[model samples]
Target: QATTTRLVNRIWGEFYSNEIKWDGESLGKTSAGEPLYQQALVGGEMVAVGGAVTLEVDDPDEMPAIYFVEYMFESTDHCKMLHGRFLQRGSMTVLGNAANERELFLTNECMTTQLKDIKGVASFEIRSRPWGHQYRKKNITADKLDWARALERKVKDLPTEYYCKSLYSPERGGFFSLPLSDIGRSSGFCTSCKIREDEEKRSTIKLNVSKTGFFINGIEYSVEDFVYVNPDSIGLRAYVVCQLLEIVPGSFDVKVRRFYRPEDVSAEKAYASDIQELYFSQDTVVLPPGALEGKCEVRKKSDMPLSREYPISDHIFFCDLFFDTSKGSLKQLEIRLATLDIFAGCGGLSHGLKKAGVSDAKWAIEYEEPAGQAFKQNHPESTVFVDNCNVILRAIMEKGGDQDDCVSTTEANELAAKLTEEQKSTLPLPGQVDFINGGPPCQSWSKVQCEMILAFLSFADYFRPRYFLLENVRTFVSFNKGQTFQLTLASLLEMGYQVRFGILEAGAYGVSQSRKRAFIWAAAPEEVLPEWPEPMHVFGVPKLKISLSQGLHYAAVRSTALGAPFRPITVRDTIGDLPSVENGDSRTNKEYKEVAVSWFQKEIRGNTIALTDHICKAHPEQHRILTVRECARSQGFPDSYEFAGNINHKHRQIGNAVPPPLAFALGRKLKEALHLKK
Candidate 1:
């Protein structure tokens, strides 16, 4: 082999471009019947049959495309040809900003190009899930592929280096787990995906515009004139009222500001207010005049009692207040808003928000009857709807009609019948709510991604809450390759709200479990955007820096939550005052047999000599599971607060709760940001 090795400089000097050298080793022919080389030299670097390379793109402005070389050959014309398979860049995939900058995904597609188009040699390391045998041999094993780290790289690493651990299908919308070893053996290009890709490339062409004004259907439209657009075209309900902002000089695009109806704001009305009222939004979009339905009038309520110039009709409307789509600062310190709680698990978030004195729970919606009863029992002042949020949302949308979906419908209407006239009247309106909060269950990330998240967002869309907060487990930050998190943020932004997110630990805020959670805060444009609450206690340090693939940064409270001004709150400190109970003890009430040893115990114990829910389950060994009361105390629930179900149900509510201390800390910050004292 050494004797056969020889230098083959086919093209240029090393300075102009590295000389090409053939190693005189041949692999078998490709499927297309081209002879493959075992190793070849290009750009002063060696590239093997399985190595990666960057091929020049047709458009010089775009980045060079990455590919894996599968075959190499010399044509009769003396030109070198290379056959390569595609490796889609993370930045170019649907993962978009959520993808790591150094990641590459294998594709089923391949292409053959001249060797000169090979811009440079690239590096790639393929990762695979190690088998049991490998683990026993101390061979490296793989965990779930970290798509978040895919797009980025490091020092001592080649600038063009990349990592591949999964197959990517453009049709699938994100990178996915697949057997990497089998990819090379796959046979054909995916025509289905190619067809979809080709179809997506076809887009609507922009037509010429009149700039200042334009005539459509023989009617004139200009800047600031209110118009009724086709609701279907804009994905709006019933009506599409807009104030034209600009008629693009050379395009069909007409920028328009939206005017929202009260029904558009919420599912229910608050009072016996006007049926003609509308609210203005800062959000704007551009559409063609083909979407223009007609013209309308939307004058301020103060400017009402119309003169002869403008008569009241179905086409006319009035606005009293600007719908400050949650994003900015509040005007004064005396800020207090009625909050509607969704996924109101035992009222943990609502309880803390109330305790902070900045918000009051006006109503709560919880799916589990036990959890709903528990929340209602703890906060009797608020109304509780113990039904599925989806059902409640649908009932509100259908206006309590006897729709077929109501078998599911029976639940919401039955709950409605129990309400007084006042409560019933207020049931559907977003007008009464200034803030909305929830922590959707985190056990199934896929379920939340598909169902509950959009349900939660739909509530926000209708409720138009001034401040919105979402809670989830820390893993949610990287769920679905971070696309879930980015989509939620993007949705909020689209709805015209300012959004920020962070991860916080319950232990950092005085809870005992060291439970970590992710939080997202959104504010109306007129309200002050809330700040992340400073940690009150020291806990484990957060070592990860989180951000969206699109380069958006969010608060990682654990980073700052570490090295805090206080000591860590421990399990011993949290539940030390609880009475001891034997295994299988069924008592729901008991005496506080132990003396308080720490501030957490003292604060959580209150003045109660009688304790509740201090029962336990014994393990075969000497260990035992903590009782409900102990669990509640560890979760920062006060001694006086009561639960309303069996041990299992109570345990779940406590386990799923946002730690009250953490919520209180967040609530206090929201208040403080508004200059309110809590």
Candidate 2:
């Protein structure tokens, strides 16, 4: 006789103690029923706010969905209602396969459904640790501590199968963590949800349009006039450029032909030209006259000469080409921006910018000898100044007649007579550089970092570069409670440069790792402020902003995967094509032993059959670190881009460098903002 053994799974049970009070302060009654409260008995089980429950769906065959109970009360119609906040499963989110089944995202959305829809109870847990995965001590709040203790007191003997640490925002398509105590408080109210509610209750706006012109907020806009139409959707810009065609007198509607700004068209299609240039479109659409925000001037191509200079402002545009959207095609007016890199690190940012085909690096300043040598090797065209950025700036300033406050001044003629031609050539004069970019190090109250920033801004003040970009750690936005960042912005604004800052992630631009950096963009008066580049990959990021004095604020580029065009790049996809090696392998050159398995690998490999810098430091399988080539691959550097140092130096250069792909995207936008201006 053959005996078969049956495996019986352990069935864990939950128990809610009667001694524990589920209901707290009464929320008042609805339909005059037993003082409708936040905690209620559904099928003999007590449920309260911040607790999870399975909600019934319209389809009986479908599995029950999870929900977080926010409020419980009776409706005036005499129906018991449960305010259910959706708990989205990992499968339902953009994270998709990357998420596990146990991870449930607590969403901001809430719906009032009949209490009968409560299918059953589900376990909700909150770990004292942030996310419960990491061991590092995170900054804890008083509210969080109180909430956790309260929850623990109420959930005695309850077995938690799933827990949530982050709140998912459907509108923003991102996850953020906060104290669970704030869930029911006014302070924790969903901002996007509140905005939507406000819009829903807002009174209908009237469109006052006449026979010849249209009225907006009270200002009259006439036909055949150039106007800015308020965008129907939220974007980087508040209004869109358009030319009024016709007015439907009684319908409050007007026909208008739209114009594409430099950002609207792909960088590949946008030719190097004046910043005021706009692409006329053949597509005509009807919109409510209320869409008109303000009037602007748009001169036809025939009206202006090629070399004509026009006053630039928020209200000026020049129409030239009639863009046909159906065809993906679109000048050879080479307007390369002369760029100077400050605090340059192996010229990584400049490398990416050059790849974008917009910037021409004329000078680079790197303090480190190794990094400076590497930058010089890679960017031979750039005059690499191996010195502190402030030192270089001071030298430039001194050459331009700037005297030291404490030093005795010599005769001007003597100073000029003592200056050599080589010395004069070494220092960049004011107006010689058209653009400057760098990531100044900021740490503590160090005077060195402070001086570097002031020196950079001074260069901008003295040179009046048409464009300037500053990159720093993401925390720079909130460093010193945003005072430093505020001062930085104020300085640029005071200098008459249009300033905007945003936090961009490298993962959104094809890099395998998620490296977020804060970037500040500034342009001279009348120059177009470069718009933040849209994410190419589906990656979600935090909503970053800082309020400053004078009603000014720094809002980061809103990142979401809701409308991303491509999937995220993975680490394997980045370096899967490279061959494996032993630990501490220092071979400078090697053949392609592995096939290019991914498109990214193929692109990075290019036509090279052999690879350099494939030496290994350490690895998981081989028990060694990643090779120099692997690190370079993660940074989106081409195989042909060589480093001028030993193995450790090369690795250090790669580690301290910005991912080239992200800079490439940023550079493309910079190119779009560049124009031939007098």
Candidate 3:
């Protein structure tokens, strides 16, 4: 009963009188050796692409005898195996939908009608309108179709005791669509199912006018057309782009099922997740006049602020949690924790800290110009130094090292411009800082990584922060064959600090990427070194540039649960749904194309409706890059958060940043491990 239902289009039953699996060609799998799970006109049997198989539960309390034809196809191109899937049978409780199965289904893309109730066959109407569920959520696990990926799952059947009704041409239970009449279908002589070359074809198909209400070429569509729908949920990005099965005149009776994108499965680790309601489809959505619509999109754009698009009520979830920190309120779970971010590119680590109970940053340092500016923009109160980082750290120590102040915001300029000697002495200093994090870029500048650790050690030698952390590419640990890491550990140990080191994948912290980075935790002798947080989710055969074993640093941070595999966050899960753009397609922000499709989207978006950074790079085929905002989102930046600088610079900073969720997970463990009661 704790189902995460998404509105999706399942291939309902349809009869292809005279059919051909495909016709007049076999261009071979398009580009990627991927199938066209497509069919055409010939004869003999039917090819059911999508449809509904209604099950009547003899026992009102029964669950699906079996749920979810959960299967997938593979291809040489790897990512193109999904063109053959589709789900059917949207669920329901007897409720209003089962009152003798009699109600007026709205007259739109889907159709509505009552069927005879057979005691042995659990035949009744099943209506599932999205939203208003008693247990709705705001953090679903799918991606936002902010835009369409010019390109893009794993890849779920039912009971006999429930009895049933099939919605399709007796021969085939899957409804077919005309959208495929001229698209990617070209195969060789096989099924040779007699070809129907005679009559003119209609553009749509309706369900339940008996079989007569349906079509043979699968083109007769009046009601029951498959269309796209958006129902909001905390557990999913948007409702699965569904098939609008049946619509009551004004009754709003619905029987749509699910079809998923690869991202849906990969982001939440679908097949391995232990969830019963998950599904995916290789086919596209259909929209006939019978298509369904509801309170989701009746008002004009002006009336409903773009940010609060779903009609699930005004800014449903976090609006009550926190929006403007200036007026944000908290009841408890609060205490002593102050943080500083060094090498804070675009503020990923600090942002994570705030999410992980450390509400704000007290100080920050970043040598990169625009990124530093971005840090200031997002964390205005944090005293940030955007100068030669060494100079800033030096000033903190020699000039006013332990003082409750920072070098003036203007002093960086005034000191070099107007007052020389006096300006140097008057510079501000570090304040009551307890925890510090962030690391230099992981590659070529790695020794700079060593230097910065020394810098922090010097600070600790005098000011001694209770907790501190540093991160770098996984390669950093093995850089110079592990010598750099060894020396780094030696220095921290010699400083009388307790230390812990290991590699962590972003997905282990619940963001979609399996991005692995090395982290080191250090504590002054009096404080306890924080333990690494446990992996929140699991992983499967890693589809990375490297092997899964290598990525986890030999289970230092486990990516699986007891050897069970869950798909790691995949490319399809992260930036897969951002809107598509062609080479030279230059536009900055655009309204999101689809609803939030993943849990990351919902959690990161919160309730502020103002959408931002939704553009995409021209496809590599088009030689394009992803939007700056997109890069940040994948790296765990929230939607409510914005970045500074131009398109190129923002992406650069995002690429160099720590994924906030990973940082957040680490911060949480640090807080508990090093709480240090006074």
Candidate 4:
């Protein structure tokens, strides 16, 4: 077999016309006094012709002589001068008579210098012959290239563009591909693309880009563009494949596919750019599938700005669009309740709900050891199941064991055998739980795509509570193609419960941080699903928003003994009186420093510590232990209640607890729902 080699030359023109050029010499002088122009060449894209060449020789018997070589100049400009050399093969002999190979060249001319000078002692080679040339000045006009073709060249010639392609996928809703030449065309090019898992399944693809926003389909989403794409690779053919699930109307899926013209291909002297291709499938896909059918139905055609209503004076209002009166206040009642808290992180829900007035929390289950310890410290009254929630739930539900039999144990069989007759009879016989509440571990559901919702649903099925509350990161609602939420809703519906969900902004509800959480509330046929609390504070605006002080006041009034109204507590009112402590301070359990800061503190300040209303302690440093007073203040803990943990643990425990005031409101609501009237 014979091999044929072809040499393709590329000429690149730098557009310094619009750029500010620094003063510099054009070329270096050679030994012969000729100006030697230094060509700026990129390693992968351009190379000096002499160092590498294609040699085609025929016949083994001929000693492989240089039969012929050709120089083709695609440039239209005339060449004024040229100089170069061809090295020849030898042990130290000039095969040819003429030693000086320097030459001058003319434009558009193919000067075939004779190789007869080096004609063989056999197998002569040619390379690295120093050459110099000047161009008969002529300007070249640039032309357009197709978007895809231009991308090919951009990726081939520029590292920045190439890196960009590697980081982002145009096909996956990344920026559109356009010829660098077409950058300023049409005022600025813009395009969009849908990432589809399979060509036919619209639900499997995530529409990454819309002309209006960087969301998948119609739902608004936040994209970490800077984080997602490499800063260096800004313009390249690299495309990512994403699955498109839904398309919101009025959004553009437009993507510039073809940008450059055919003429630009040869004129630009470019090679095809590289593309990063991503193949995605539903089975292996990490993100939730697009929104479930009917899942996004609740979303309004046009998103309504958050209602401006402040103070929510009436606690109920009419929504003309939904044609319903959104109720807020709880009915008058007091009820004993059983609560099963899954993922009961240190019993925050248990603590909050109990304060809200739930009579008793029958079972509190937490998987994490530290949190469980904290929960135990705070709620010694409640049964603390420290184990994987799923395992405990499955065991309890399956055996119908006594609630009391469930204890801290490593062996499943030992726990199973400990079930007493009464415990068996009292176990949450399906549908017996009054209120089931939990904030499942949301890491799987929110941070990345995982089947956390499925796990939640499984527990939900086993412990059929009359009412269930699920808390998760705000993005949980959009996970797993939203199949996770869909399945959960379906399960609740199948079990004959009404469901309501909303993303609640904690800040709006009076917390300091702008934390938003997704909450799902479900109630049996007889009970009304709970309503989200009205925002007590107006945030980020120009109004005398209800103050945190007001929220505390409202909580106090709502939770105060039956009919009595009370003064609202302020941050100062709660912690002003505590002794300060510093970081890492330590001390044994001590007595109160003084009386409670205010009436709010007095209420929860039980008989454990007398004389002093607040249990304030001094640590090692000038900064007070988030003084006991501070902890109680933040926790909505009354001044009278005594805290048992060390300073650090105490703070963590307090920070983790639900504010008693908020709990009071919830407790009242639950009481009314159950018709346990005062």
Task: Give candidate 3's total backbone clashes.
Answer: 85
Residues 1-678 of candidate 2: C-alpha lDDT, one tens digit per residue: 100001000000000010223356665553444345677676667887678888766888867888877666654685766666778776565433324445676766677677766777877775443211011113224434655865685679654466655555444323444335456542224444666686665444445434676445546567798876655532323246778898774356778887776646643233223346577777788876556656788775566544321111124556656666777544211867788888888888998888778887888878778888888788888888776544455456567665331111234334434556775577777657778888877663222232444556555655667778898887986776665665565455434445666777777676777787888887654556677776645565655554533344445565444433233566766776677777777778778887665557766777878788887754446566777888888888888887877778887888778987777778777776674343
Q: After superposing candidate 4, which stretches have Cα over 4 Å from the reference?
A: 1-334, 369-380, 397-428, 444-453, 478-483, 505-515, 537-571, 594-629, 639-655, 676-678
Report per-prediction Cα RMSD to one decimal: 24.3, 21.0, 29.1, 30.8
Model 3 lDDT vs. the true structure? 0.44
lDDT of each: 0.62, 0.62, 0.44, 0.38
Tens-place lDDT digits, model 1, residues 1-678: 000000011000111131787887655554555555667787788877667888776888888888877657765576777767788776765446644566687776777788876888877777553322113113211212232233344433637457775555443222334444444432233343455476555333334244567666556666789887656677513446789888664346788898666555443231223445667687899886678756777766466554321001135666766676574321211577888888888888888888788888888887888988888888998888776675566556455442332223355556545546664565756466778888766433322323455667767765567778888888987876676676665455435455666666666566667777878787654456676765544465664355544354434543523233233454555554455567788877667676765555655676877777877764233367767777777677888988888888988887777777777778778877778322
Among the numbered candidates, top TM-score falls to 2
Clashing pairs in 2: 617-625, 618-624, 618-625, 619-624, 619-625
Worst 10 residues of 4 by lDDT: 4-13
Winner of 3 and 4 under lDDT: 3
Q: lDDT per residue, candidate 3, 378-433, as tens digits?
A: 88887776665545554554454232222223444333343357545645444466
Full ranking by TM-score: 2, 1, 3, 4
Candidate 1 backbone overlaps, count: 26
Residue 194 error for model 4, in Å?
44
TM for every model, in the order presented, reads 0.49, 0.50, 0.45, 0.39
How many Å off is the CA of 665 in candidate 3?
0.7
